[PDB]
């Protein structure tokens, strides 16, 4: 470890978040980092005893040191535990429990399509520590075009996730929007970013948020919602979902 | 601890295999094991520096000890490296290169589905290599979960045309033959072991298991099974062929 982040340091940072009482398991983190002069980026590896090593890459705005990397890793841990804030956790739980076909990882909500282990089409992905502006270039390149998305409108969410889930999903976005605006407020209020991209086969909507936390420069969080072009309600979807091959798709590590 | 298997012991055992020249990377193994008296089984854990951990479960035929577990783990390593025997590796390559839709990943030859997460590949299996496994040890589970059993004849190419259609039938038949000849001629017992062929019919697929038992100087037995799956409709069929190109498949993920 170039340096260590104790679990107590993490818990003290997480304790400044409103409504957080059941964070993820926190262990001492051994942090390694290397600076790359060619592309001006820092590669960070975090190792704990229980979980497997996570890695990050960020672009430094001044010469890298341990203090900057420590602050960056904290911002990722803070963002990672927003999902466990009471009202945010409850808002996601209402989405998942409101649909027997929805099953959750913890970071991905997907439509259950087959049993293996389970097979899913992702529709909601939680992306802590990510903002859409940092990936918009590849999104513009790989998508057909960018569309518009009305932020607070129930009919938009009926389109995205159907009437069965529209209000729950809309409340999930609103819960994150309110939490960042009221509980992670900057002196100069940050506005949420909403960006919609159309692909050959799907619509993707990104909801990105910037939050103020005492111990870091910025807390980033993005929620991605996917709508596949064929309506999940009927037609080709029923032909596709009943094909028995799906229950024999194998995952090779 | 509880005992180690150095890479030299592994390489010495592997060097007795005819036609093996490019084995898998070999490292020292740290082996842990524990006996379970309720179901009379031994659970084994094997750890290396580069690609740990592997796990096994077997049923001991006498009171377990290190020497038995060491022999068992060696038999799994030997079976694992049969895939790299020249004529067996070549016979597998002929199946793989004989179909642009066939891809190989790990012990599975099949149809690519999705690229998943962090190096994972979602694949529809067609041929599965199963080193260290014999069908007689899973047949009870297979009989209960299947509709019925059939009789499969390895002499007949048309039955391989049923399994993997005509584009792959002869390459696949030669793959089975290569393993059949290798075990009979290169891993022979004094009392010859006959290969096991068992076909199982499910509602949605047919699975044919080709199992083999091999004699090796350092272990009681070498086991190897090849599983071939035919699904409800053949691969080159039209109504299927449009299914593997549905764009949804690339977005599939596993929990
Ligand atoms: N990557 C970011 N923090 N983006 C937000 C900039 C305003
Ligand atoms: N059912 C069995 N696997 N019996 C042991 C067979 C041993 C050896 N393969 C032989 O035939 O001589
Ligand atoms: K559910
Ligand atoms: K191929």
Numbering used by the authors:
A (entry chain B): 2 to 117, 121 to 257
B (entry chain A): 2 to 256
Publication passage describing the model:
By performing a screen based on affinity purification and mass spectrometry, we observed that a previously uncharacterised phage protein specifically binds to two RNA binding sites within the CTH of RNase E, and by doing so efficiently inhibits the RNA binding and degradation activity of the degradosome assembly. As with the 756–775 binding site, 9S rRNA can be competitively displaced from the 583–636 fragment by Dip, and the addition of a 4-fold excess of Dip is able to completely remove the bound RNA from the RNase E fragment. These results demonstrate that Dip targets both RNA binding sites in the C-terminal half of the RNA degradosome, and consequently blocks the binding of RNA to the RNase E subunit.
The dimeric form was confirmed to be the predominant species in solution by analytical ultracentrifugation, while self-interaction was showed during a bacterial two-hybrid analyses (Data not shown). Interestingly, electron density for an unknown small molecule ligand can be seen in this region in the structure of apo-Dip, which we have modelled as a single arginine amino acid. The unique structure of this protein resembles a partially opened scroll or a clamp, and it is tempting to imagine that the two protomers of Dip could act as pincers to capture a binding partner at the dimer interface. However, through a combination of structural, biochemical and bioinformatics analyses we can conclude that the binding site for RNase E is actually on the outer surfaces of the Dip dimer, and not within the “clamp”. Since one dimer of Dip possesses two binding sites on its surface, several possible RNase E binding models can be envisaged.
